[PDB]
RNA sequence: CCGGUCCGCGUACUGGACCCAGCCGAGCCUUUCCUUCUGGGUAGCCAUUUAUGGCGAACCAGGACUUUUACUUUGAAAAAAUUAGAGUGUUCAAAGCAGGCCUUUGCUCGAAUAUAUUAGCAUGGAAUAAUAGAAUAGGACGUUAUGGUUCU
């Protein structure tokens, strides 16, 4: 099965409810139903983390299994998910997709920025639907970072979590990353705490 | 559905998978059956006994406990009304009709719902002489159904 | 011996109603026990060491039975310790009339052989009401009925019900399985 | 009205199948209905199914593998001569070496294959493939 | 597919979907292979040893996909109580 | 949904169901012991009564019929059996 | 399972399967039996008086009854010619039903076989679809149950 080392341990979950990741949308569809544990009285659906914490380590699992480090291609279309993915790809060698993602370049093969991933992470499915729809257009399985509202077509991992939040999507990316690295060996183990902190994967508006 | 309409309801009473009489049921099988003779004569239809058992008497199904249904006690017993009930209310509803319709005469509406209800005593009493209910000579007729049940 | 409905009962039956001239020694339930008879005693083994006692009864008896088996059970099985004692009514069934078969009067329901099958069924477990049943059909051929049993007076049961399994087997050949769905647990 | 059990039973198995499911419910039950699903569960194309008794027409829980293509009724149950079974195999099934017409004879329901091994015939009654 | 003699006459057997069981075809670009790693009790990544699944491209087009991974995984072991079998 | 438990339905969602919707269908209704506030005499009450049922004693409505359940008169307490 | 032989995967032939499983059956027992009548005829029951008392099923051959169908299997019947089809060097063929043998004071394979199909006839089976039955019981069994009223 899997080691209790790498059960959701207290000091991540409180991480995650601190970032509001567990708000999930108003309106949820039937395909996220499984991933939603109560609606809050305002409205505001409570994610199971518990559940949000599985699909990450089973993500960071599909990564490491890809031979090359960049052939994995993280995107987010969101401005408040640019400075998480171009980090992401620093620390693990991914391919960073901030900002517009150039339709055709998956299909065009001779637009500038033409790649073959074997593997596209998206931060959301509704910012990211170019992205997203032309991995189904070349074989390329599909990672995605799903609130309560965000479609479920043409995505196989599911990371329910908060795509609205501004320490929602930079907390998600660091886990992910820190994970990625465990099982690559770079962090020694499960226990070690690591330098990166959730802060850098932040946005930062232009005033600072 | 609705052999008369275009609607398409559903509801109607959902039996329990229980056959048996609950646990906290007491009386006997006779004592539901002297029961219903005594409301029997005093004019109610199966479908009001019935009623009266669950809503006043905790008897959920007069078949569970007796082992009977409640038109067949009533035949075994010389109680059962020469008319079908359903047949009787249906007749009734017609007579009250063409009585309005004689005074009415331009409710024209009135005379549509005339046709269905008569076309759905045709086929109930063609049905009952079927199974010998009826007699076979049995025919509905709307001069004389004042005298059936008034 | 009269208290058995059959000629040259067994030891076994005499056991049985020598018991039966025994409980209603105190007055609580004796207005009751001189009516009671019962036509045999067939008794099977069953797996962990107990034998299943099957007490068969008239059918129209069975309703006088009905009201004093829970207490008469309890004391049955101190006077035969390891026993796990039943009480089934002896129904008829009626086979199906051939095609060329020669006219015979029209075979009422409650003689067929799924009506019985199913009145034995309710029979076995008769203090809790069934709720439920389903068929399974497995892929090897093979078809088990499963029986959802009330959580009600289920404690004069809960210990047994493998015995009511090997017992329904012995009397009609097919696999059932008894499960109550609403325990505690 | 209702006019036949085993069509909305097959539909509803067929919708099921189609669209990835592996499991479908089916009401009402029938004789028939348990015969047919025995046959294709005999094939290998279901599963186990389970029977829910409601005192009542019934119900069925039928589990699906996705090997099964289609299958269907024959409305009406066609009087079928042994001659003739060669002929409503070539217009039904895909192909000579697999696939089965389920026929209703006196001596039970039973797929083509077995009907010519037993030498006996009825009116026809799906096919499963 | 075989012959009389028992050579296999078939060129390419075909892949299967891991859900729905429906053949993939050699054209279906929207199915995809996904490959996850084996993790030893020390928590590393297994180097090039991985749990293979297989989904047709009719899968995802529904959505379903994620929903069909959460039961072939807690399946295989790879989750724990995140997929219900009752709903 | 592709998989799911068809013969174990959740129970929470078994009870949202339409009556006639669920596995078996089963009523929602029930059978009630009454008692008055001015006297006291077990009298069985069908949940959904269409009758004005009355106790034996005297002659006081003890509930009157509506759409749905029966409503239940003012110092009259239920239990269900 | 010697493939010797038969006439070289050969492999047909065929001793020999020891039959793995599978397939088409037939009975017997599970609450499940043509209710039957007249023998054979009586052999073994109930052998205390047998094949001199009361096992008619211990299988036939001679009688008596029978809910009605539909459906499907098999059989007889559906003229020959025509059709499909076996054989046959009309010099080939279309055809035809011929013909072949060491050469004959004669010998001698044949002239098949299928198909007909609604209706009718006989037959096995009893799924499917109808149909009848015991409700003011005017209902069923008593094999040797007790009488009475009629009729042959
Ligand atoms: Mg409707
Ligand atoms: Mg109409
Ligand atoms: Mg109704
Ligand atoms: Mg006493
Ligand atoms: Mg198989
Ligand atoms: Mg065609
Ligand atoms: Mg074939
Ligand atoms: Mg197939
Ligand atoms: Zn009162």
Redesign the pocket.
Same mark, same amino acid.
């Given at each position: 099965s899997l080691p209790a080392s790498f059960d959701l341990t207290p000091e991540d979950a409180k991480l995650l409810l601190a970032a509001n990741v567990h708000l999930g949308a108003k309106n949820v569809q039937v395909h996220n139903k499984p991933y939603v544990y109560k609606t809050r009285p305002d409205g505001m659906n409570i994610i199971n983390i518990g559940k949000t914490w599985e699909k990450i380590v089973l993500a960071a699992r599909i990564i490491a299994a890809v031979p090359n480090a960049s052939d994995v291609a993280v995107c987010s279309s969101r401005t408040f998910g640019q400075r998480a993915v171009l980090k992401f790809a620093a620390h693990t060698g991914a391919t960073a997709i901030a900002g517009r993602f150039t339709p055709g370049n998956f299909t065009n093969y001779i637009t500038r920025s033409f790649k073959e991933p074997r593997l596209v992470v998206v931060t959301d499915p509704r910012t990211d639907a170019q992205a997203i729809k032309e991995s189904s257009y070349v074989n390329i399985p599909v990672i995605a970072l799903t609130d309560m509202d965000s479609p479920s077509e043409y995505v196989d991992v599911a990371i329910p979590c908060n795509n609205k939040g501004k320490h929602s999507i930079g907390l998600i990316w660091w886990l992910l990353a820190r994970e990625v690295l465990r099982l690559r060996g770079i962090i020694p183990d499960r226990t070690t705490e690591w330098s990166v902190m959730p802060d850098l994967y932040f946005y930062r508006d232009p005033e600072e | 559905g609705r052999m008369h309409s275009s609607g398409k309801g559903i509801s109607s009473s959902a039996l329990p998978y229980s056959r048996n009489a609950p646990s906290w049921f007491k009386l006997s099988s006779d004592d539901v059956v002297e029961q219903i003779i005594k409301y029997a004569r005093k004019g109610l239809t199966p479908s009001q006994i019935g009623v009266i058992l669950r809503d006043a008497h905790g008897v959920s199904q007069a078949k569970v406990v007796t082992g009977n249904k409640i038109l067949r006690i009533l035949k075994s017993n010389g109680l059962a009304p020469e008319i079908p009930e359903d047949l009787y209310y249906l007749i009734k509803k017609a007579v009250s009709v063409r009585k309005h319709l004689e005074k009415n005469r331009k409710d024209k509406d009135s005379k549509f719902r005339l046709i269905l209800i008569e076309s759905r005593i045709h086929r109930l009493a063609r049905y009952y002489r079927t199974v010998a209910v009826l007699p076979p000579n049995w025919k509905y007729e709307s001069a004389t159904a004042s005298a059936l049940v008034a | 011996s009269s208290k058995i409905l059959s000629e040259n009962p067994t030891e076994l039956e005499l056991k049985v109603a020598q018991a039966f001239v025994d409980l209603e020694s105190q007055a609580d339930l004796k207005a009751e026990l001189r009516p009671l008879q019962f036509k045999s005693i067939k008794e099977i083994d069953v797996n962990g060491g107990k034998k299943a006692l099957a007490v068969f009864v008239p059918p129209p008896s069975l309703q006088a039975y009905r009201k004093v088996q829970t207490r008469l059970t309890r004391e049955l099985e101190k006077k035969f310790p390891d026993r796990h004692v039943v009480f089934l009514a002896?129904?008829?069934?009626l086979?199906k009339?051939?095609?060329?078969?020669?006219?015979?009067?029209?075979?009422?329901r409650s003689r067929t052989l799924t009506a019985?099958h199913d009145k034995?069924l309710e029979d076995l477990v008769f203090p809790t009401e069934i709720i439920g049943k389903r068929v399974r059909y497995l892929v090897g051929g093979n078809k088990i009925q499963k029986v959802l049993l009330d959580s009600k007076d289920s404690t004069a049961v809960d210990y047994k019900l493998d015995s009511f399994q090997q017992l329904y087997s012995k009397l009609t050949?097919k696999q059932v399985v008894f499960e109550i769905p609403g325990e505690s647990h | 009205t209702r006019t036949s059990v085993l069509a909305d039973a097959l539909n509803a198995i067929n919708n099921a199948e189609k669209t990835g499911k592996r499991q479908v419910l089916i009401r009402p039950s029938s #004789?028939?209905i348990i015969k047919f699903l025995t046959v294709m569960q005999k094939h290998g194309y279901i599963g186990e199914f389970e029977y829910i008794d409601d005192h009542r027409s019934g119900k069925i829980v039928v589990q699906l593998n996705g090997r099964l293509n289609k299958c269907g009724v024959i409305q009406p149950?066609f009087?079928? #001569?042994?001659?003739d079974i060669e002929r409503w195999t070539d217009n039904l099934l895909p192909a000579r070496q697999f696939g089965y017409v389920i026929l209703?004879?006196?001596?039970?329901?039973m797929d083509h294959e077995?009907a010519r091994?037993?030498?006996?015939?009825?009116?026809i009654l799906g096919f499963v493939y | 597919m075989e012959n009389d003699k028992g050579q296999l006459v078939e060129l390419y057997v075909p892949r299967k979907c891991s859900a729905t069981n429906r053949i993939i075809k050699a054209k279906d670009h929207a199915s995809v292979q996904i490959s996850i790693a084996k993790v030893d009790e020390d928590g590393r990544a297994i180097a090039g040893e991985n749990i293979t699944y297989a989904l047709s491209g009719y899968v995802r087009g529904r959505g379903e996909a994620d929903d069909s991974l959460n039961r072939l995984a807690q399946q295989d072991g790879l989750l724990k109580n995140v997929w219900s079998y009752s709903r | 949904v592709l998989v799911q438990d068809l013969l174990h339905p959740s129970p929470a969602t078994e009870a949202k169901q339409h009556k006639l919707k669920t596995l078996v269908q089963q009523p929602r209704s029930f059978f009630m012991d009454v008692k008055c506030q001015g006297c006291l005499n077990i009298t069985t009450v069908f949940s959904h009564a269409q009758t004005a049922v009355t106790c034996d004693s005297c002659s006081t409505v003890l509930c009157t019929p509506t759409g749905g359940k029966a409503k239940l008169t003012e110092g009259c307490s239920f239990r269900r059996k």
């Open positions: - | - | 002896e129904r008829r069934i086979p009339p051939a095609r060329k078969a020669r006219k015979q009067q029209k075979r009422p019985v034995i050949g | #004789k028939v149950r009087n079928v #001569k042994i001659n209703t004879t006196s001596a039970g329901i077995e091994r037993k030498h006996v015939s009825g009116k | - | -």
